[PDB]
């Protein structure tokens, strides 16, 4: 089937965040716990262990499906992710399952057409929503919101819109709000009653 990317798949109902989200990392699990269907942000400066968090979420996590998305990482780092992450593996009742039959990828270098970088975020959210409607707990990680932001600024500066403070467009706040709210726990539509959730982990590179 075909679904427009800028629209939202209707839902039966939205529910409070109830069941917790856990990870193998002790600190994040006990001191600053996350919840299923929640929203989280992590810095993305060079040298920090963002790779640790990404890999731990990919491997140890309650989520049935996982979607990693890109928005431009200067190319070589994109090769690094594309190389390392298909190789990973986990114990599934004693099996290796190194194929990563629970992940999907979206990859954009620093020279793909501007709208591809701009709209990869909405593509990822749409895929996540589609898997959410299957009554599953899905988790999503964005490599950098800052890249999506500068892509938005780029298309605005193309359109010669009236520049706001720091040269960024007026869309910014509303777009980010709409993006982040899209997540949350949801009772799905369908006679075979069911419930799934969707959680987001963005990154920020000041």
């Amino acid at each position: 089937q075909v679904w427009p990317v800028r629209q939202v798949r209707p839902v039966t109902e939205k529910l409070p965040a109830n069941h917790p989200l856990l990870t193998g990392q002790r600190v994040l699990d006990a001191l600053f716990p996350c919840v299923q269907g929640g929203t989280t942000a992590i810095p993305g400066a060079f040298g920090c262990g963002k790779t640790v968090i990404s890999q731990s979420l990919s491997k140890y996590s309650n989520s049935d499906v996982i979607i990693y998305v890109g928005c431009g990482e200067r190319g070589n780092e994109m090769s690094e992710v594309l190389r390392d992450f298909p190789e990973l593996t986990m114990e599934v009742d004693g099996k290796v399952e190194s194929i990563m039959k629970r992940t999907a990828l979206v990859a954009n270098t620093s020279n793909m057409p501007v709208a591809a970088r701009e709209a990869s975020i909405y593509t990822g959210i749409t895929l996540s929503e589609y898997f959410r409607d299957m009554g599953y707990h899905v988790s999503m990680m964005a490599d950098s919101t800052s890249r999506w932001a500068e892509a938005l600024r780029e298309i605005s500066g193309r359109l010669a819109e009236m520049p706001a403070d720091s040269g960024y467009p007026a869309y910014l706040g509303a777009r980010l709000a709409s993006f982040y709210e899209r997540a949350g726990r949801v009772k799905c539509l369908g006679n075979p009653e069911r419930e799934g959730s969707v959680s987001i982990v963005g990154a920020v590179s000041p």
Binding site: P163, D165, S166, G167
Partner: protein
């Protein structure tokens, strides 16, 4: 000798601490506030142009 050294040293160290506090809690915030204001004005002017 030790005694007189002690007392003079005490007074000097308190002087230096005064200077450090003076630069730390007064001068820096004023300058950075000024700097932010200049940035804002320049951005507004460029926008009007």
């Amino acid at each position: 000798s030790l005694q007189t050294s002690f007392v003079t040293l005490d007074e000097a160290i308190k002087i230096t601490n005064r200077r450090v506090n003076a630069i730390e809690h007064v001068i820096i915030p004023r300058i950075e506030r000024t700097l932010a204001y200049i940035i804002t004005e320049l951005d507004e002017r460029e926008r009007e142009e």
